Design a protein that fits this description.
By secondary structure, this protein is an alpha+beta fold. It contains 16 helices and 17 strands. Bound molecules: the ligand CN(C)C(=O)CCN(C(=O)[C@@H]1CCCN1C(=O)[C@@H](NC(=O)c1cc2cc(C(F)(F)P(=O)(O)O)ccc2s1)C(C)(C)C)c1ccc(Br)cc1.
Length: 555
């Protein structure tokens, strides 16, 4: 809460200086109002002379009014300069608080909001949750409360100058203040239309999906009065670039969305103005690989603040989505999305990503997604990272630090196949998460699957162990396969690599049941016995009702 306390201090100073300008604005209006009354007195003074007639009294009444006329005329002249001075002083104070406001806004919007948004982007790859927008709304409320007060303050100060003009520096001073105000409100309004909950980045046609679009300055401006409509629209990466550059053909889009319209709702209790699209669906998609084609859901809205004097057109784009029609296309779709959420640079043109990235950056991305997919805190160890670097780079080294300067290209990750294989690194890696996720989630968590060791590594671990000591390994030759490697002293071969099982095999008999059937397996690596690790998962054979068993019995 270091920068958090400085943000709060600046907000508190901003409200104190805005009350000062308000006090001085009412004071200026009083000064001007009295000056207008004193000016009428100087008019009555001449009308008093006009009511002339005997110079025995008319010589004394003429001198009384002359002395009075002069003093009031002198007071008026001095008060006019005071009116101009206090006016300049107010504009200077408004210019000062607006410059401070600009700095305070840049902090909330270009830093804290971007950090929240990035936190949300990385959460797509199974990263840590971004958290509630409560803090960001609390600040955007104050930003709006303050810019709106100063705006109405200057509109009032301007009204005074209309009713009593005094030419000088004040005109261009107010022209500057106004330009600053439109810049700040436009920025505050356009930037605070954000997507609280993103749509699915791997989207299947004809599948119900949801999104949430919040407006952080909803409660503090006159926006909830007429809650605006938001129109969800699916567009392509090219269409997204031209939408930003403004070189578009108005309604250019790439498909229909069912229930693509929603009206923002204000929740008094929380102060939130937000469109909840709960029943969206992709009816059709226009496509000019399918897997590498990035789309985005564009949310538009049009609304005003206070009166039709201030109207805005807001547009927010979702994180890139990949559309799949089969479901079987998910394998490679996840890879392009995984790359996007991880390696996207801030302030990029629509869905631009780096061609190559350094190996430890890709390590973060794989570890993050891996833990999320298997639903465990046991991630990829330093040894596991080396195993994958050996596989990926086709390098011998067993030192993670060696790979640190190397670069994985997109084609090296999920386009060109591995050395002697018919699959890519992503296909191999995703294959492992997929077999681990469907089944073996508790097994992976309980450490029973060592997995990321090559055929040689497993032998150079099991040799010095008793007959029947095994380890569970990931097959190289078969995507999503698990191989049992075990040492058992015998003629011309001591280490044994059993045939790899895939999800089809597990669907017939579980990993635990299959291990329990094989008597030649007795000790899971390193010491712990087989039944000690898999007794939990052996199937208690249940009697069938068809065989005449009225109550559930365990044979
Ligand atoms: C109760 N019961 C019937 C059973 O399930 C147990 C019986 N069983 C077997 O013993 C089968 C029966 C046929 C030959 N067999 C073998 O295991 C023979 N082994 C292999 O044939 C192979 C070993 C590797 C290693 C790899 C590798 F190293 F992991 P990779 O890194 O290159 O991918 C890649 C392919 C292969 S093929 C063996 C020489 C050990 C006898 C079994 C049956 C079916 C399935 Br599927 C799985 C195992």
């Amino acid at each position: 809460s270091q920068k958090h306390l400085q943000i709060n201090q600046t907000f508190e100073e901003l409200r104190l200086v805005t009350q000062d300008t308000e006090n001085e604005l009412k004071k200026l209006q009083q000064t001007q109002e009295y000056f207008i009354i004193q000016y009428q007195e100087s008019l009555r003074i001449q009308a008093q002379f006009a009511q002339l007639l005997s110079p025995q009294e008319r010589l004394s009444r003429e001198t009384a009014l002359q002395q009075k006329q002069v003093s009031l005329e002198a007071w008026l002249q001095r008060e006019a300069q005071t009116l101009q001075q206090y006016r300049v002083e107010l504009a200077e104070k408004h210019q000062k608080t607006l410059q401070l406001l600009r700095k305070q806004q840049t902090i909330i919007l270009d830093d804290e909001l971007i950090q929240w948004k990035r936190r949300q982007q990385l959460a797509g790859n199974g990263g840590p949750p971004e958290g509630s927008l409560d803090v960001l709304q609390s600040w955007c409320e104050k930003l709006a409360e303050i810019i709106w007060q100063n705006r109405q303050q200057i509109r009032r100060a301007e009204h005074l100058c209309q009713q009593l003009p005094i030419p000088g520096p004040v005109e261009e001073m107010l022209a500057e203040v106004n330009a600053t105000i439109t810049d700040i409100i436009s920025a505050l309004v356009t930037s605070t239309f954000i997507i609280e909950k993103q749509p699915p980045q791997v989207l299947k046609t004809q599948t119900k999906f949801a999104a949430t679009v919040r407006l952080l300055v909803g409660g503090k401006l006159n926006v909830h009065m007429n809650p605006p409509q938001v129109k969800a629209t699916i567009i392509s990466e090219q269409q997204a670039k031209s939408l930003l550059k403004n070189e578009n053909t108005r309604n250019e889009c790439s498909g229909e969305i069912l229930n693509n319209c929603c009206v923002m709702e204000y929740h008094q209790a929380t102060g939130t103005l937000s469109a909840h699209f709960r029943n969206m669906s992709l009816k059709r998609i226009k496509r000019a690989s399918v897997t590498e084609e990035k789309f985005t859901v564009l949310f538009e809205s049009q609304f005003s603040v206070g009166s039709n004097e201030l109207v805005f057109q807001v547009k927010t784009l979702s994180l890139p989505v990949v559309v799949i029609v089969h479901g079987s296309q998910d394998h490679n779709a996840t890879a392009t999305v995984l790359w996007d959420n991880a390696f996207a640079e801030p302030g990029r043109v629509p869905f631009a990503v780096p061609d190559k990235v350094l190996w430890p950056q890709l390590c973060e991305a794989l570890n993050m997604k891996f833990k999320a997919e298997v639903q465990s805190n046991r991630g990829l160890t330093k040894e596991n990272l080396v195993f994958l670097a050996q596989k990926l780079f086709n390098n011998s080294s067993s030192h993670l630090e060696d790979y640190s300067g190397l670069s994985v290209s997109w084609s090296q990750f999920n386009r060109e196949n591995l050395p002697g294989w018919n699959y890519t690194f992503w296909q191999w890696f995703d294959g492992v998460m997929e077999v681990l996720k469907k089944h073996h989630k508790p097994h992976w968590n309980d450490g029973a699957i060592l997995g990321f060791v090559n055929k040689q590594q497993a032998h150079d671990l099991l040799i010095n162990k008793p007959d029947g000591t095994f380890l569970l390994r990931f097959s190289d030759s078969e995507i999503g396969g698990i191989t049992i490697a075990w040492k058992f002293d015998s003629p011309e071969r001591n280490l044994w690599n059993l045939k790899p099982f895939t999800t089809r095999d597990f669907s017939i008999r579980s990993l635990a049941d299959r291990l329990g059937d094989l008597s030649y397996l007795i000790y899971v690596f390193p010491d712990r016995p087989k039944d000690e690790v898999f007794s939990k998962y052996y199937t208690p054979v249940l009697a069938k009702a068809v065989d005449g068993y009225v109550k559930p019995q365990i044979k």
